[PDB]
Amino acid sequence: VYADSFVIRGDEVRQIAPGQTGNIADYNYKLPDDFTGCVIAWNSNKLDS
């Protein structure tokens, strides 16, 4: 089991779908299309800002 956690600005939360390009993903971390697993995402404006 591998949990990979980070924080991204809320404009492209739905871009992290596998096999998709995007400036926050194609130059930081990309995901293979044959990936199996789950995605969890939520807003954290008040804990960080």
Chain residues in the site for other proteins (CB under 8 A): 11, 14, 19-23
Residue pair 44/3 in contact (Cβ under 8 Å)? The answer is no
Nearer to other proteins, 23 or 43 (CB): 23
Distance CA(19)–CA(36), nearest Å, equals 12
**In whole angstroms, how close is the CB of 32 to other proteins at the nearest point?**
15
Distance CA(46)–CA(16), nearest Å, equals 23
**In whole angstroms, how close is the CB of 9 to other proteins at the nearest point?**
11
Residue with tokens 């096999």: 19
**In whole angstroms, how close is the CB of 21 to other proteins at the nearest point?**
6
